Structure formats: C-alpha cells, structure tokens
C-alpha cells in the first residue's frame with residue numbers, strides 16, 4: 001500500500017498565546033483528514049516506508065475585533081515545516097513561509113493564509129511537524145489549516 | 157489512462173461585480189490548459205475514475221488606477237476550492253486561501269496571488285469547482301489564474 | 313529511473329540590484345537539494361525524459377533596517393516560472409505569483425513568501441527557470457527559496 | 469421498479485440507501501444488500517444517502533465572532549450565528565459590523581440575531597442625534613417634568629429646548 | 635545533407651519542419667514525413683517549427699491598462715501597449731505612470747505611445763510652472779495682446795508680468 | 801552485547817556508527833561493516849551517526865543582520881549572532897531591535913552581543929534624560945569644573961544646575 005497523510009487542525013486543541021509553538025494536535029480520520037501506512041503521534045507524522053514524498057502545508061491566520069486589539073505592532077505570521085528523527089533529537093527546517101503584517105487598522109476582520117510544498121527524500125523513522133508563530137490567530141477550519149504528504153517513488 | 161486536468165481561466169468570460177461567485181468558464185485545451193479522463197462542464201470538473209487526487213489552485217488579483225478607485229475599503233481577497241456531487245446538491249469547502257488587503261493607497265497598480273493544494277479521496281461523479289471573492293479583480297492570464305488535479309493512486 | 317529535481321538557492325551567488333533577473337545559480341546536491349535524470353545548467357533545469365511533471369516554486373523576500381531604507385516606494389514582489397527550449401530561443405511564462413507591498417513602515421524587519429505549483433506536459437530538451445523581481449531582497453535559506461519538479465506519468 | 473427516496477440501483481439490482489446518521493460502508497453486492505455504519509464522533513449525514521463517508525460539523529469559531537445556536541448531531545448540521553452587533557456576510561464568509569443609522573434615523577426593533585440593522589426615519593415627536601446601529605429614535609423631552617416650559621420645538625435630529633421662565 | 639531552415643533530422647532521416655500557422659502533430663516515421671496541423675482558435679506559431687503544440691495569444695488586459703495595437707493571428711503574436719499616460723515597465727511587467735516634468739522643464743513632443751515621458755529644459759522665451767507628464771513649455775504672454783506693457787520679464791519657471799501704465 | 805555510543809544493531813549484527821565528519825554511505829551487510837564517507841563541501845555532522853546524508857550549514861545572512869561568530873566545519877555547526885543594536889528572537893526567528901531604557905534608567909554594561917538590553921534605575925549622583933538602548937546613566941556635572949556653584953541638585957532624570965554667583 002502506497003503511503004499518504006492529509007491532516008487537519010484539531011480545532012479543540014489549538015494552543016493559546018503569541019509565542020511560536022509546535023502544533024501537537026491534528027485530526028487523522030474525520031472530515032478530509034486521512035492517513036495510510038504512516039503513523040501520527042502528538043503532531044509528529046512518522047514515516048514508515050522509505051521514499052520520496054511530496055510534502056505540503058496550508059495555514060490560515062485570522063483575527064476579529066470582538067477578541068480585542070491585536071497585542072503589539074510587530075506582527076509576523078509564519079509557518080515552518082520541520083523534520084526530526086527518533087534517531088536525532090535535533091530538528092531542521094524543510095520549508096518556510098509567511099509575511100509581516102499590519103493588522104492594527106480599524107476594520108472588523110483580518111485574514112491571511114500561507115501555503116508551502118516540496119519534494120523530499122524521507123527515511124522510515126523520520127518525523128514531519130508544523131510550527132506556527134501566532135497560535136491564537138490560527139483558523140480552526142478543516143479547509144483552512146492542514147498539512148500532508150504522499151509518496152511519489154521508491155529510493156533505489 | 158491516468159486522469160488529470162490543468163485548467164486556465166477563460167479570459168473572455170470572467171464575471172463582473174464584487175460579490176463572491178463560482179467561476180464557470182475555464183479553458184481545457186488551448187495553451188497550458190489540458191484534460192484527460194476527466195470531464196469539464198461550466199466550471200465543474202467531474203471525476204470519472206475513483207482515486208486519490210492532488211488538487212491545486214493559483215488565483216491572481218490585480219487592479220490598475222485607470223479603472224477608477226477600488227469601491228469600498230473592506231477588501232478581502234479569497235479563493236475556495238469546493239466539492240459537489242451530482243448525487244448531493246449541497247457543496248463543501250475542501251481548501252481555502254487569501255488575505256485582507258488595503259489597496260486604497262496612491263500607487264498606480266496593485267497585485268496579489270493565492271496558492272492552495274491538497275491530497276483528497278475522490279469518487280466518480282464528484283465535481284470540483286472554484287469560488288472567488290472579487291471577480292472583477294481577477295487576472296485573466298493563463299500563468300496567473302488556474303486550477304488542476306492529477307491522480308496519484310487507486311482507492312483499494 | 314523516475315526523474316525529479318528539488319533545487320535550493322545558491323546563497324553565494326544571488327544577483328544584486330532591483331531589476332528583474334533570471335536566477336542562474338542553484339544547489340543540486342547539498343542539503344535538501346537533489347536531482348535525478350534531469351540536468352541543471354546555470355539556473356536552467358533541462359528535461360531529459362518526456363512526461364507530465366508537477367512543477368513548483370517557493371520564494372521568500374526579506375529586508376532588515378541595517379541595510380538602510382528600501383529604495384523607492386513602488387514595491388512589487390514577484391516570481392515567474394518560465395519555460396524555454398534549446399529549440400526555441402524565446403521563453404514563456406508557465407506560472408506567476410506575488411504581491412504589491414509597502415515595506416516603508418518603521419519596524420526593523422519585513423518578510424514575504426510566494427508559493428506556486430502546477431501540472432505541465434514537458435518534452436526532452438525543454439528548460440524550466442525562475443525569474444524574481446527584487447533579487448537583493450531574496451532569502452538565501454534553503455528552506456526558503458527553492459524550486460522543483462517531479463514526473464507523474466508518461467506522455468502516451 | 470423502485471422509488472429514488474429510499475433506494476438506488478447498482479448492478480441491475482434495487483438496493484436500499486443509508487438512513488441519516490449512517491454512511492454507506494460498502495455497496496450492495498450480487499449476494500447482499502448495502503452495508504450502513506453509524507457516523508463517527510462529531511460527524512453527520514442529514515439525508516438518505518449513498519455516501520462514502522460522513523461530513524464533519526463546522527466550527528462555530530469565537531475568533532470569527534461565531535456562536536452555536538444549535539449544536540447538531542449525527543443526524544443534523546451545526547448552526548452558527550454572529551454575536552451581537554454583527555451579521556453574517558456570505559461574500560466575505562465573515563461576521564461584518566452592523567450598519568449604523570444616521571441622525572434622524574433609528575434602528576428598528578426587535579433587533580434580529582445574525583441579521584444587519586434596518587434603519588427607519590424618526591416619526592413626529594421623536595428624534596435621533598447620533599450614529600448608532602442599536603439605538604432607536606428617542607422621544608422628545610417633556611419640559612414640564614423638569615419644571616420648565618417648551619421654548620422651541622424639536623426636530624427628528626434634535627431635542628426640544630426647555631426654558632425656566634416666569 | 636540539408637539546411638536547418640526548413641528541415642530537421644530525426645531517425646537518420648531529413649524531415650521537413652512545420653510552416654508558421656501549423657504545429658508538428660506527429661514526428662516523421664521511417665515510412666512517412668512530418669504531419670503538420672493548423673493551430674486551433676486563438677493560438678499561433680510564428681516560425682518554421684518542430685513544436686508539440688501552438689502558443690496561446692497574450693491577453694491585452696484593460697484591467698492592466700493594456701490595449702491591442704495588433705490582434706495577431708495563427709501566424710503572428712498579439713501586440714499590446716499601455717494606454718495614454720502610462721508606459722510598459724519590464725521589471726514589474728506592468729503599466730507604470732509616466733514621469734512628470736518639473737517647473738522649468740517640458741514634456742517632449744510628439745508623445746510616444748507605450749513609452750515614458752522625456753523631459754527637456756525650457757528654451758529662451760518659454761516657461762513651465764507646473765509638474766506635468768504631458769505639458770510642453772508654454773511661450774511667454776505678449777502684453778500687447780492684453781492692451782498692456784511688459785513690466786518685468788519672465789523666466790523658464792514663470793510668465794511675464796504685464797502692466798497697464800500711461 | 802554492545803554500547804549505543806559508537807555502535808548500532810541492524811541485521812542481528814553489531815555494526816559501527818560513523819564518526820563526526822562522515823555520513824553512513826551504506827548500511828552494514830551480512831558480510832561487511834558500515835561504509836562511512838566524508839561530508840561534502842559546506843556540509844557537516846557533529847555526532848556519531850547512522851545518517852543518510854550530511855547537514856548543510858546555516859547562512860549567516862547579513863540581510864537578516866546576522867554575522868558568523870564561528871564558521872563551522874565538517875564536524876561543527878556554524879554559529880551566527882545579531883550585529884550591534886539587535887538580539888536574536890526565537891519567536892520571529894529574526895534580529896529584533898534592542899529595548900530602550902527610559903529616562904531614570906540606564907543600559908547595563910558590558911553590553912552582551914546577541915542579547916537584549918538590560919535596564920537598571922540610576923543610582924544616587926547619576927541621571928539619565930534620554931531613551932536609549934546603549935547609554936548608561938551619566939554622572940551629575942561638577943559645577944566647580946565650570947567655575948560655578950551648585951544652585952539646585954539633580955535627580956535621576958535631570959542634571960544639576962550650575963550658577964555663576966558672587
């Protein structure tokens with residue numbers, strides 16, 4: 001069986017605050033969320049089968065005026081697609097996206113989305129995970145905040 | 157034959173106005189536009205063969221000062237990749253992207269592009285289509301406004 | 313062997329200035345950079361085997377205040393994914409992304425990233441290359457500025 | 469021959485659709501009928517269906533100024549509404565600030581949840597001197613309650629002026 | 635031996651290229667020559683080619699301030715230009731506002747379509763007192779036409795001053 | 801039995817890991833041990849490893865206000881720091897402007913490279929009348945050096961005032 005995963009944000013477990021975090025809760029079964037021959041554990045997607053995978057993420061940020069004013073006026077909205085390995089405790093950036101923003105105007109709603117994708121060689125045991133800059137600005141919709149992988153070819 | 161589609165905007169049939177619409181005209185043959193073992197009808201891309209497809213869209217918005225000032229100053233530029241089914245009349249969002257913008261400054265030209273992509277399980281009979289927020293801001297270039305799909309693997 | 317390439321920016325050879333250029337230096341071996349059954353020459357990725365490839369690019373722009381003020385205040389950050397052919401000297405846009413920006417505020421750092429992707433029919437001899445609007449704003453990180461291709465299926 | 473209401477045809481056979489709350493786990497074979505299984509946690513299907521899998525309930529995101537007016541179940545969708553002062557706009561797919569009524573106009577009551585303010589011009593004996601999305605036209609002051617007399621009459625935009633004369 | 639102008643080699647054979655207006659539908663086999671088919675609607679090829687498929691004409695998007703100066707056909711590309719007051723810039727790939735000439739300078743005529751304004755300093759007897767991308771230097775007023783006399787002479791930046799004296 | 805420090809198990813065999821500066825080119829077979837090859841140009845591995853390929857050194861981008869304090873090699877990672885006036889922030893992954901100390905407070909010395917300014921209130925006999933991320937509290941003026949007398953004493957926010965009296 002050919003491996004893949006399309007993981008959508010666990011809307012009931014998005015961390016609060018304004019410091020950068022690793023997202024550690026995603027759906028793997030309900031809605032468009034799915035997984036096959038890969039394993040998922042606290043936001044770390046484990047590769048079970050060696051190969052070249054296409055990796056992708058879509059992240060949406062949003063803020064409404066009923067939540068009060070957006071804290072300070074340095075605002076940089078970022079995603080990092082990160083690789084670790086049960087072998088190597090240390091982690092490294094595979095892909096990075098985002099923009100600096102000024103959401104301090106006087107309109108009721110603010111929105112921004114980031115998309116990234118790439119083709120990577122992955123070994124069994126390696127883990128893929130997502131980091132975001134402003135967790136309390138994350139859009140909890142399944143069509144909005146997600147990441148995935150699918151195998152394209154074997155190593156050889 | 158393995159199914160795919162890369163569809164570019166029909167520049168001669170982009171709807172006018174500022175209300176959200178479903179784009180119902182795309183090229184399927186000329187330029188980079190192509191289709192194989194999928195069918196296309198008024199902006200609805202029908203799946204003919206069950207499988208896991210990678211879905212993607214790129215949408216560009218633009219405005220020049222010779223068109224006059226951009227109407228009101230609430231501006232949110234959005235794409236929605238939507239799934240329907242000849243079976244189920246109702247439709248659901250698969251993917252969503254975009255940003256709030258302020259294009260009311262005093263420079264002659266304004267531009268913004270959205271990209272989205274994801275891996276989805278699709279059944280024959282299901283239809284994929286695109287919704288955009290500001291149709292009269294759409295870039296009619298084939299390298300600019302397009303969407304597509306290609307099959308990666310069978311259901312099993 | 314199935315063809316692919318994931319190419320990351322050659323950080324030691326990013327051109328200077330504010331005019332649009334073709335990026336002519338990428339890594340093909342170190343880090344996440346890799347290539348297989350495709351050939352790479354001065355920023356032109358040559359196709360060796362006919363087929364349908366998925367093409368993608370991620371481009372990041374950045375500016376810090378220690379470099380001085382950002383020149384004029386018309387700023388449009390753009391990527392173009394371009395196709396040429398040793399056959400045809402002329403080149404054509406396949407994909408285009410980006411945004412107009414105002415980075416003239418009083419914060420120390422500014423950032424923006426563009427992503428694009430699409431499915432294209434490519435013949436042996438054809439070349440893919442990247443154009444960017446503001447070369448001296450390019451992020452030299454391997455997770456930041458890259459482009460790639462991988463074959464999905466044969467022509468038939 | 470059979471009705472499209474509770475049935476569907478497949479392999480030259482009339483097979484039964486799945487009831488709301490259940491999805492079509494496997495299609496009818498030449499030897500057995502449809503197999504229907506209950507929708508998983510937080511999922512629903514609201515019709516008699518041939519559906520591959522169940523639909524996930526929408527999030528009533530408080531960060532979008534949304535709130536559930538109806539939670540939904542395995543049989544019914546969740547219903548959200550914009551919190552007070554905002555209304556749902558299907559263009560932005562977002563909760564937009566309600567329209568304010570200019571002076572001389574008042575907000576019509578009762579104010580409808582999730583719907584934009586309707587403005588009405590003030591009638592004789594009433595006025596409005598503010599921009600507001602919530603305020604109705606207020607009636608003129610009665611000078612006699614202040615121990616005073618009506619000096620000059622009001623408009624739809626301004627109140628009466630009271631005088632303490634003799 | 636054969637020329638690269640109208641021919642190409644393939645399977646140890648000299649085969650004929652496709653004429654402008656036609657694309658290479660199938661390469662030459664060991665038993666037949668090239669097969670060339672006409673370009674479809676709104677498509678072109680402008681050279682003698684071995685091309686897989688035809689090129690789509692560019693859009694002269696009015697929303698980009700562009701206009702067709704030449705429509706193109708199956709043989710020729712479409713030509714666009716920026717409408718009055720703008721010029722094409724190959725950095726932004728967009729129609730940029732023309733440069734304005736400061737006071738003391740005038741816009742050179744004839745004004746070229748799709749090209750940026752060229753500024754020239756005003757010559758003796760002419761002036762410019764505005765920033766403009768279109769205005770040439772205007773000549774000094776002749777006081778005698780106003781029934782007046784020249785009080786003080788003009789500059790390149792200001793007009794003459796006329797006086798009604800006796 | 802063997803230690804995890806320099807060894808790893810694979811096909812029921814105890815095989816040797818690769819030394820820093822080398823990557824695991826091919827795993828141990830049933831007939832040979834591990835094959836380890838040197839890291840290519842600008843690449844490193846800093847531990848005893850079973851690694852597929854070497855890691856690329858980070859760029860100390862001057863455009864991000866970064867500078868190498870340690871270049872790295874095939875064995876060690878590269879070390880970057882924010883240039884004077886800025887400090888590394890792991891939230892934005894960027895060099896943020898240092899915090900300024902308000903009047904009455906001074907910047908603590910020695911100033912640490914790549915670390916944000918620490919503010920301290922001015923002690924008796926010292927003052928600070930500016931917002932600055934670099935300036936320490938400056939001591940009061942001694943009027944006698946100006947040939948004058950102390951008229952009024954200073955604060956932590958203002959200097960002494962000197963008078964030339966008799």
Ligand SMILES: [Cl-]
Pocket residue numbers: 024025026027040041042043044
């Ligand atoms: Cl998880």
Ligand SMILES: [Cl-]
Pocket residue numbers: 026027028029030033
């Ligand atoms: Cl789940």
Ligand SMILES: [Cl-]
Pocket residue numbers: 119120121122343344345346
């Ligand atoms: Cl890789």
Ligand SMILES: [Cl-]
Pocket residue numbers: 180181182183196197198199200
């Ligand atoms: Cl269509």
Ligand SMILES: [Cl-]
Pocket residue numbers: 182183184185186189
């Ligand atoms: Cl077409």
Ligand SMILES: [Cl-]
Pocket residue numbers: 031032033034275276277278
């Ligand atoms: Cl799906």
Ligand SMILES: [Cl-]
Pocket residue numbers: 336337338339352353354355356
């Ligand atoms: Cl190169």
Ligand SMILES: [Cl-]
Pocket residue numbers: 338339340341342345
């Ligand atoms: Cl390299």
Ligand SMILES: [Cl-]
Pocket residue numbers: 187188189190431432433434
């Ligand atoms: Cl193509």
Ligand SMILES: [Cl-]
Pocket residue numbers: 524525526540545546547
């Ligand atoms: Cl729902």
Ligand SMILES: [Cl-]
Pocket residue numbers: 690691692706711712713
């Ligand atoms: Cl053309």
Ligand SMILES: [Cl-]
Pocket residue numbers: 856857858872877878879
């Ligand atoms: Cl490093």
Ligand code: NA
Pocket residue numbers: 569570571572573574575596597598599600603
């Ligand atoms: Na009112």
Ligand code: NA
Pocket residue numbers: 735736737738739740741762763764765766769
């Ligand atoms: Na002038």
Ligand code: NA
Pocket residue numbers: 901902903904905906907928929930931932935
């Ligand atoms: Na201070």
